[PDB]
Amino acid sequence: PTHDVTTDRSQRLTLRFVPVDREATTYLYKARFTLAVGDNRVLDMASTYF
C-alpha cells in the first residue's frame, strides 16, 4: 500500500521519557513520568518497556 500507511511529517519513531521525579526509599524506588502521546498518534501500551 502507498497512500496512507505512513507519514512524511518528519516525526520521531522511538521516544524516551526521563522521570519527572523520584523517591529512592530504603526498599522502593518510585519514578513518575509524563508519558505524553502527541496528537495524530495512537501509540500503544505493549511497547513501553522501562
Binding site: 526509599t25 530504603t26 526498599y27 522502593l28 524506588y29 518510585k30 519514578a31 513518575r32 513520568f33 509524563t34 508519558l35 505524553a36 502521546v37 502527541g38 496528537d39 495524530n40 498518534r41 495512537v42 501509540l43 500503544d44 501500551m45 505493549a46 513501553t48 518497556y49 522501562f50
Partner: protein, 50 residues
C-alpha cells in the same frame, strides 16, 4: 563475579494496560519498583541473600 553493572528492561505485566491502545493526550504513567535484594535476585542454593 560480583560488581555487575546491568541494563535490564523490565516489561509491563499488568493486564489492563499490558496491550492498551493509548489515544493522544498527556498521561502520568508512574510505577513503584522493589529494591529488596532477596526478592529480585534468584539464588540457586536458596541461601538467604539479604
Amino acid at each position: 563475579g560480583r560488581y555487575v553493572p546491568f541494563h535490564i528492561q523490565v516489561p509491563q505485566k499488568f493486564f489492563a494496560i499490558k496491550n492498551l491502545l493509548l489515544l493522544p493526550g498527556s498521561y502520568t504513567y508512574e510505577w513503584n519498583f522493589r529494591k529488596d535484594v532477596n526478592m529480585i535476585l534468584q539464588s540457586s542454593l536458596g541461601n538467604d541473600l539479604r
